[PDB]
Amino acid sequence: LRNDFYRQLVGKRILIVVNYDIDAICASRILQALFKYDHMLYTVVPIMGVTGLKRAYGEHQGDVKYVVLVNCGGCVDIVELLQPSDDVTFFICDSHRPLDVCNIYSDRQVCILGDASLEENIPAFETIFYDLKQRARRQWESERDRIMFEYTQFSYYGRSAALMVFELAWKLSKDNMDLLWWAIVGITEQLLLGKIESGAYTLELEQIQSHVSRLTNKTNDQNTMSASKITFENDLHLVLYRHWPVTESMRYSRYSSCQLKLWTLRGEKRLHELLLEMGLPLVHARQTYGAMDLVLRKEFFSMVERLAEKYDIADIVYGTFTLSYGYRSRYAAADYVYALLAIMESVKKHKTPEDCFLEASDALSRQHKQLLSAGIDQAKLLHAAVFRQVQSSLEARQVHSAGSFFYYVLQEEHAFFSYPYALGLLARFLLRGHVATSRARQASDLPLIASCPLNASEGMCLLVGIVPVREDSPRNFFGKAFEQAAQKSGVALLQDFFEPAVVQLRQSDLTRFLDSLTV
Amino acid sequence: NQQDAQINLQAVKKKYKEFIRTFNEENFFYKYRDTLKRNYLNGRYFLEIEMEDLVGFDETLADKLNKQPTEHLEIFEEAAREVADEITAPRPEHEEHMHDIQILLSNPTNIRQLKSDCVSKLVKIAGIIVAASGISAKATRMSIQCLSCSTVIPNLYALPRKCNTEQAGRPKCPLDPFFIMPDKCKCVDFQTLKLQELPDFVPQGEIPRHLQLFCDRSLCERVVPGNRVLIQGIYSIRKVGKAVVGVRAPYMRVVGITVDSEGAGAISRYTSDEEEHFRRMAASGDIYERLSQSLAPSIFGSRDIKKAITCMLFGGSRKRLPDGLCRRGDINVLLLGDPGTAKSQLLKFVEKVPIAVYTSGKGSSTDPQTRNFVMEGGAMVLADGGVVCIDEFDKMREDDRVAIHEAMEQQTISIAKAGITTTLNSRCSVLAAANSIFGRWDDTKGEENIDFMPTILSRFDMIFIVKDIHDESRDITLAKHIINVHLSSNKSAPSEPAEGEISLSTFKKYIHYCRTHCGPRLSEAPITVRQLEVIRISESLAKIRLQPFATDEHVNEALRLFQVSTLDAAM
Amino acid sequence: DIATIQKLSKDPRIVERVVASMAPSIYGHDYIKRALALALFGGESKNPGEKHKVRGDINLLICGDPGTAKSQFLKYTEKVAPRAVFTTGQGASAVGLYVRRNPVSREWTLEAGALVLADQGVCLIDEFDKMNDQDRTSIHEAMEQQSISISKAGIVTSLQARCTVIAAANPIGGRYDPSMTFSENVNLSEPILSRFDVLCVVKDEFQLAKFVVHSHMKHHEIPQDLLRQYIVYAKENIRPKLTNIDEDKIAKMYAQLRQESFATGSLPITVRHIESVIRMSEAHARMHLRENVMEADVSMAIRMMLESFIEAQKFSVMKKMRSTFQKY
Ligand SMILES: Nc1ncnc2c1ncn2[C@@H]1O[C@H](COP(=O)(O)OP(=O)(O)O)[C@@H](O)[C@H]1O
Ligand SMILES: Nc1ncnc2c1ncn2[C@@H]1O[C@H](COP(=O)(O)OP(=O)(O)O)[C@@H](O)[C@H]1O
């Protein structure tokens, strides 16, 4: 509840828009507007790491007390870090979810937007910030069965960033259909069960539906061009259906690749033998869907929904949205998020990251739409430069087992991969390839680790983490796992990024780090 | 007006016209509508469109349109005129008369993919232009005395039995008293265009096939050979049938080509920050000897003597006189020596660094259609402002060695195959390259390198010889100037970092300003008659220091470069 | 049927294994077994930046004798190669090997050059020295500037040259010249020979007779029905490059042997005399799928230069022997 707090927001302020995410601009551009709505001038932040926290804020030692927190909170007993707080209020809407109870109380300088049916963490203040010696430790450890089961076993993230702001705002006589699209941006940002879980997706089939299947404020005369409100249909999050031909999906898609084995040949013969059953032509299977003839393009999903029932891929039907403005197009919300990462370009100007952040935040406007096309372009070639290591690897087998996980190392960087999060993708593309498919799953379901050649930043062995698949919701030990060798030895380690699952070693102090970390 | 489907009218009736009048979003800019206005800035009489905006309206015309565009694009013509002619005046008070128009459309394909199935159909492919004809003729209508009706035509028969010199009583007039009367006629253009397939789609073990094309009105005078095209046309016909049974007609026509902009070459046919780039380097008086390590921007040679190029590319000045002569503004320079010195690849680069052609000897060098004898010409083609540098003078036939004597010392050109006299000339020049007899041991002695004439050594200037001189000190260096120069094949980028030894394209336009301003001059002021007759290089330095003027002996810097040459013919 | 190649055909023992099956006619002249073990085995683009496309051609010949095998010289490779184009030389060679850009109108036919057909193939030749110079103009600059020039016709066109040159010529004025120079052993030109790469020579002074009669009594190792696709792999797969390993040594091979072997027949030493080497020193890894290059493949390449070259110089013949057999 901020119906009482929001109305305090008239004085000076800052709108931090926190460390790297799509969630940021989605849940802020709304309010970079709303500030001039209340006749408030706005002020924003490029953040890349907790690095950025006080090298930016320390430049601003004031008392501007209407303050944001997103994507952080798993940081410090935040007065102990943000000590220049005397009564300076903060406002949190963070997704960096599992927070310590040091940070809520002293309940002047924070606001608790936390309410859940999980009441399991109460005496942590009655244990840590309160703690004869023997029994104190008896409590300490026998309840750290639960407490250290928090914050020393795994980590995860929660819910939206401005769906709260939607919940505030649909009451305030605001129906920014565009901003509902922005909400969907934030949805498939990380609520995609392909990335991080919803589960209740199947019951948000009602939620925003009931928001807008309610609402057609022009229920009788809605046949105009601009800003026609959006419409629900059961659709895909297969890779980039729209502007490239079917065969590009049928190649560059994982949920084929995990179930159909496409990088090899029998994938292709088998594919053809299904395009028989669809009876689509081959030219027509190699022109952009928007480019093809029509009745095939029209009748596509009508057949594909049903007579894909039988062929090892059960989970291609999803629930999604898609729209245009006028007559140039029909965009799709899922045909955007893979464009989003395209300006996340890690060039060696020092200008690129922040100014590309400004560019992206300039992007989600209807007025600013030219540039997005170039992003789509880049994404396609990225998706096909994936292969630039896949078959060379999965057939050469760079794979390392290395005990009770699987082990990978790349040893040469890509300008493609200076931007880091490729390191998550290729893992999630290829463990399928051999380590899942040429075997039973018994050697398949373990997570994986991925070196990161830093050919540009002097050599620092960047990393990200991975789960086993088909049991995803069981949170990542990697939230902790890599503290192991850090805790056993510790070796030039940083946790400079917002995220737990991210680290930075030295170029050549990584193997003994492993042999420590093997366990 | 069979309005169930395939109607004769709907398009021009209300539809395509109204699509035009619906192509409308605010700012009051989103128009397919004011386009032609700014076409009417001149009377261009055309307009461009898409193939994926109709789809922004419907899914019903896209399939109906692409099938029979031989009809639809003239429906669109009629819509165009009957809409646009509204615009000459709001109400009836301005019109000279209307006129005619054009409409222009916009996934590629190839030539070995399109056949009997792909007929009466519109296509996107891409190729490479070859050559094509001129601009002749075609009309739409005219009439005849006999009936005097505008001879309506379906396609861009011959008045059957009705005569119409007829209703005069009885007296009849069968079998066509039809003298076609073109003074009543209309009029169109033609070119008959042409393509070659890619260099990527198996012309190797097979033959490269191709086909012919066909244009109409304003799209000629647009395209010349050595270009790269994308297109949309029609697969259509010209013959009839049922030729051991029925072999027949290939061609296409045009609708709306889209050509290429290939990168950085084509400042050829169709800034001042770059002038700031130009001039602040010449503000430095350090170009004469600085760019003596630039013309070979990445490898060794001519080093202390490359300064003598500063005069030639800018040249001297074609300083005409009141009297007869048009002086030798063109002036020539030489090289000669053995192979291995990178002498093959150096001049290979020089074509990359103004305009010319480069090989040596017999390889430039002294139709079955519409009965006209073509003659593509001589050697001023790419060299009249362009100049050349070539090997194999004596290594060449002596039939095509008169021309050099006419070309070069004077451009005394003429023609005598048929009976007419090309009185051609040029501002052109050459360099010579060599693998003739015995090099440095020859050059000091007398005069037999060329085994026929003493003339040569006539109207040429600096004699700078190519050698592989034994120098044990420089042996290891050019033993090491050669590996990674070759190996990794890597010398691309870091030559451009130099101060002014850089940026080949910038250099190209540096020069094509530098000489290209006016005919600057000099000031007041062993020294023989021919060496002298270098006076033209007295003129040079005012383009080199970019002066108006200079005196004799500061520019006898070149004499320090030429006295190097004089040791060849010292005595 | 892949169990042979990946285990057997990438060793340097293959210059016996392949040489076991290289020229199944007689034992003779074990050099060219090594040579043809290299000869179909190269081709490379590596066009540099800003300069041009540089070089990927091979260029070979031997001077034979009437009675040698300079006719029966080249047969076996006709069937096998990925590309092969054969022509016996003049006697019936034409100039078609005159294009005004006058496309071949109906029932009018005029022809043009076969060099682009089997671009990245070869010209298999006897009577090379017999052909006509105006054809030689086309034949030359393919090998020099990777292009050739149609001469002052309607078009001055070219013809693409990513390809290789081989031949089987005959001597000049007789049979064979001694270690006396080779321009006079057979009368080619020099500036055509400037672009030439590989050599070997066949004379004979005094097993075989029992062989020949056994072979005349035919009353009636590599597999034969694949052996192309390995050479495809050698022409396909493995392609490393490197910096100067120790080839700075050649500043001596340049300077010393320019000047120790100074004045008998000792010009023909160049960087193109080792650009020739560069084309095939790499190719040892085309054979072996090495992915790198050491002085191992160097010394064997020098064993080819060491052996081909010594015949092309005056009968002061030891000039190669002490000077380079240490590098054997
Ligand atoms: N100083 C040098 N710097 C770079 N390359 C050189 C040098 N000297 C010789 N070369 C080599 O010589 C080759 C060109 O030889 P070339 O001039 O064609 O001989 P010829 O004139 O007999 O045909 C080039 O490929 C180049 O690698
Ligand atoms: N070293 C050799 N190895 C195998 N056969 C040889 C050899 N030397 C000569 N011959 C014989 O020479 C014959 C071919 O002679 P040939 O090549 O036709 O002479 P020419 O080349 O002048 O026509 C063959 O039948 C072959 O048996």
B36: tokens are 């032609």
Q: Which residue type occupies B163?
A: C
B127: β partners: B229
User: Contact at 8 Å (CB) between B209 and B111?
Assistant: yes
CA distance B35 to C33: 73
B341 vs C contacts (CB less than 8 Å): none
First-to-last alpha carbon distance for chain C, in angstroms, is 37
User: Is B273's Cβ below 8 Å from some Cβ in C?
Assistant: no
Q: Does an H or E element contain B272, and which?
A: helix B272-282
Annotated binding residues of C for ADP, written as ranges, equal 71-72
Taking alpha carbons only, the member of B429, B468, B206, B175 closest to residue B318 is B429
In degrees rounded to 5, what are phi and psi of residue B465? -95, 145
Instruction: Using a threshold of 3 CB pairs under 8 A, tell whether chains C and B touch.
Output: yes
Cα B230–Cα B232–Cα B237 angle in degrees, nearest 5: 130
Dihedral sign for Cα atoms in the order A234, A238, A241, A246: negative
Q: Residues near ligand 2 with C-beta < 6 Å?
A: C 25-26, 28, 66-67, 69-72
- The residues, any chain, with a CB within 8 Å of residue A305's CB and separated by 6 or more, are A234, A316, A317
CA distance B205 to chain C (A): 5
In degrees rounded to 5, what are phi and psi of residue A332? -135, 140
3-state secondary structure C103-160: CCCCCCCCCCCCCCCCCCCEEECCCHHHCCHHHHHHHHHCCCCCCCCCCCCCCCCCCC
B449: tokens are 């390198």
User: Contact at 8 Å (CB) between B134 and B191?
Assistant: yes
B124 vs A contacts (CB less than 8 Å): none
Instruction: Determine the distance separating the centroid of ligand 1 and the alpha carbon of B341, expressed in angstroms.
Output: 4
User: Contact at 8 Å (CB) between B124 and B232?
Assistant: yes
User: What are the strands of the beta sheet with B333-337, ordered from one edge?
Assistant: B388-390, B430-432, B333-337, B463-466
CA distance B114 to C308: 54
Cα A175–chain centre separation: 26
- The residues, any chain, with a CB within 8 Å of residue A249's CB and separated by 6 or more, are A238, A239, A240, A241, A256
Distances (CA, A) of A403 to A442, A502, A514, A516, A519: 14, 21, 11, 12, 7
In total, chain A counts a number of residues equal to: 519
Dihedral sign for Cα atoms in the order C180, C181, C183, C186: positive
Specify the 3-state DSSP secondary structure of A371: helix
CB within 8 Å: B488 and C243: yes
User: Contact at 8 Å (CB) between B516 and B314?
Assistant: no
Cα C264–chain centre separation: 25
Distances (CA, A) of A100 to A73, A480, A498: 8, 16, 15
CA distance B239 to chain C (A): 16
Which residue in chain B has the smallest CA separation from C258?
Answer: B470
- The residues, any chain, with a CB within 8 Å of residue B266's CB and separated by 6 or more, are none
Burial of B508 (0-12, 13-18, 19+ CB in 10 A): middle
C243: tokens are 């910096």
Count of C-beta atoms within a 10 Å radius of residue B322: 4
3-state secondary structure chain C: CCCCHHHHCCCCCHHHHHHHCCCECECCCHHHHHHHHHHCCCCCCCCCCCCCCCCCCCEECCECCCCCCCCCCCCCHHHHCCCCEECCCCCCCCCCCCCCCCCCCCCCCCCCCCCCCCCCCEEECCCHHHCCHHHHHHHHHCCCCCCCCCCCCCCCCCCCCCCEECCCCCCCCCCCCCCCCCCCCCCCCHHHHCCCCECCECCCCCCHHHHHHHHCCCCCCCCCCCCHHHHHHHHHCCCCCCCCCCHHHHHHHHHHHHHCCCCCCCCCCCCHHHHHHHHHHCHHHHHHCCCCCCHHHHHHHHHHHHHHHHHHCCCCCHHHHHHHHHHC
A332: tokens are 């799709």
Specify the 3-state DSSP secondary structure of B493: coil
CA distance B460 to A378: 57
Count of C-beta atoms within a 10 Å radius of residue B278: 17
Burial of A287 (0-12, 13-18, 19+ CB in 10 A): middle
Give residues 53 to 112 of B whose Cβ lies within 8 Å of C: none
Helices (H), B327-445: 343-352, 403-407, 439-443
User: Is A290's Cβ below 8 Å from some Cβ in B?
Assistant: yes
C46 vs B contacts (CB less than 8 Å): 489
Q: Which residue type occupies B117?
A: D
Nearest bound ligand to the CA of residue B434? 1
Relative orientation angle of helices C295-309 and C272-281, to the nearest 10 degrees: 130
A155: tokens are 């980590």
CA distance B384 to B374: 22
Q: Residues near ligand 1 with C-beta < 6 Å?
A: B 299-300, 339-345, 435, 478, 481-482, 485-486; C 194, 271-272
- The domain covering B272-569 belongs, at the CATH homologous superfamily level, to P-loop containing nucleotide triphosphate hydrolases (3.40.50.300)
C207: tokens are 């097993």
C125: tokens are 């030749």
Cα A430–chain centre separation: 20
User: Contact at 8 Å (CB) between B343 and B337?
Assistant: yes
Which residue in chain A has the smallest CA separation from B58?
Answer: A327
User: Contact at 8 Å (CB) between A186 and A163?
Assistant: yes
**In the block, residue with structure tokens 């001038």:** A41
Cα B260–chain centre separation: 13
CA distance A291 to chain B (A): 7
Which residue in chain B has the smallest CA separation from A294?
Answer: B59
Q: Whose CA is nearest to atom 21 of ligand 1?
A: B339
CA distance A20 to A354: 10
CA distance B207 to chain C (A): 9
Instruction: Determine the distance separating the centroid of ligand 2 and the alpha carbon of A65, expressed in angstroms.
Output: 102
Q: Among C29, C31, C33, C68, say which to mutate for ligand 2: greatest number of ligand atoms within 8 Å of CB.
A: C68
**In the block, residue with structure tokens 């190029």:** B309
CA distance C19 to C28: 11
- For chain B, the C-alpha Rg in angstroms (whole number) is 33
Q: Which of the other chains make 3 or more beta carbon contacts under 8 angstroms with chain A?
A: B
Nearest bound ligand to the CA of residue C68? 2
Closest CB from B364, B367, B492 relative to C49: B492
Specify the 3-state DSSP secondary structure of B113: coil
B297: tokens are 């921007």
CA distance A243 to A97: 37
Task: Give DSSP secondary structure letters for A287-352.
Answer: SBTTTS-SHHHHHHHHHHTTTTTTSS-----EEEEEE-SSSS--EETHHHHHHHTTS----TTSSH
B534: tokens are 């270098």
- For chain A, the C-alpha Rg in angstroms (whole number) is 25
C132: β partners: none
CA distance A514 to A408: 12
Specify the 3-state DSSP secondary structure of B337: strand
User: Contact at 8 Å (CB) between A295 and A284?
Assistant: no
CA distance A470 to A488: 32
**In the block, residue with structure tokens 């995220």:** A499
User: Contact at 8 Å (CB) between B259 and B227?
Assistant: yes
CA distance A241 to chain B (A): 17
A186: tokens are 């934030």
Q: Does an H or E element contain A449, and which?
A: strand A448-449
Long-range CB pairs of B514-521, under 8 A, 24+ apart, other chains included? B514/B314, B514/B543, B514/B546, B515/B313, B515/B314, B515/B315, B515/B543, B519/B317, B519/B318, B519/B319, B520/B317, B520/B547, B520/B548, B520/B549, B521/B317, B521/B319, B521/B548, B521/B549
What DSSP state is assigned to residue B304? G
Q: Whose CA is nearest to atom 13 of ligand 1?
A: B342
B226: tokens are 């050595």
With the CA atoms of B149, B153, B158 and B162 taken in that order, what torsion angle do they form, in degrees rounded to the nearest 10? -40
- After which residues, if any, is chain B broken (C to N > 2.5 Å)? 106, 156, 242, 270, 353, 363, 365, 366, 525, 533
CA distance C213 to C231: 34
Specify the 3-state DSSP secondary structure of A269: helix
Dihedral sign for Cα atoms in the order C258, C263, C264, C270: positive
3-state secondary structure A274-303: HHHHHCCCCCCCCCECCCCCCHHHHHHHHH
C87 dihedral zone (left: phi>0; alpha: psi -120 to 50; beta)? beta
Q: Which residue type occupies A249?
A: S
User: Is A281's Cβ below 8 Å from some Cβ in B?
Assistant: no
Task: Give DSSP secondary structure letters for B159-206.
Answer: --S--SS--SSS----S----EEGGG---------BEE--SSSS-SSS
CA distance B13 to B456: 79
Q: Whose CA is nearest to atom 6 of ligand 1?
A: B342
Give residues 160 to 199 of A whose Cβ lies within 8 Å of B: none
Q: Which residue type occupies A479?
A: G
What DSSP state is assigned to residue A19? S
Burial of B31 (0-12, 13-18, 19+ CB in 10 A): middle
CB within 8 Å: B348 and C145: yes
CA distance A174 to A168: 10
Distances (CA, A) of B232 to A248, B70, B218, C21: 25, 13, 16, 56
C86: tokens are 């054969």
Count of C-beta atoms within a 10 Å radius of residue B407: 22
Closest CB from C105, C250, C255 relative to B472: C255
B235: β partners: B252
Buried-state track A30-43, b at ≥16 Cβ within 10 A, e below 16: bbbebbeeeebeee
**In the block, residue with structure tokens 């693409």:** C160
CB within 8 Å: B349 and C134: no
Count of C-beta atoms within a 10 Å radius of residue B223: 17
- After which residues, if any, is chain C broken (C to N > 2.5 Å)? 97, 206, 220
**In the block, residue with structure tokens 């620092």:** A460
Taking alpha carbons only, the member of B339, B335, B317, B353 closest to residue B390 is B335
B56 vs A contacts (CB less than 8 Å): 326-329
Instruction: Determine the distance separating the centroid of ligand 2 and the alpha carbon of C19, expressed in angstroms.
Output: 20
CA distance B193 to B212: 6
Instruction: Determine the distance separating the centroid of ligand 2 and the alpha carbon of A364, expressed in angstroms.
Output: 81
Helices (H), A150-265: 163-169, 177-190, 201-212, 246-252, 254-257
CB within 8 Å: A225 and B107: no
CA distance B211 to chain C (A): 11
- The residues, any chain, with a CB within 8 Å of residue A426's CB and separated by 6 or more, are A386, A389, A390, A450
A293 vs B contacts (CB less than 8 Å): 63
Distances (CA, A) of B210 to B197, B252, B255, C104, C117: 7, 11, 19, 11, 18
User: Contact at 8 Å (CB) between B308 and B561?
Assistant: yes
Annotated binding residues of C, written as ranges, equal 71-72
Taking alpha carbons only, the member of B569, B511, B498 closest to residue B386 is B511
Task: Give DSSP secondary structure letters for B218-230.
Answer: SSSSS--SS-EEE
CA distance A490 to A484: 9
CB within 8 Å: A326 and B25: yes
B342: tokens are 């990178």
In degrees rounded to 5, what are phi and psi of residue A449? -130, 150
CA distance B47 to B111: 28
In degrees rounded to 5, what are phi and psi of residue A462? -75, 160
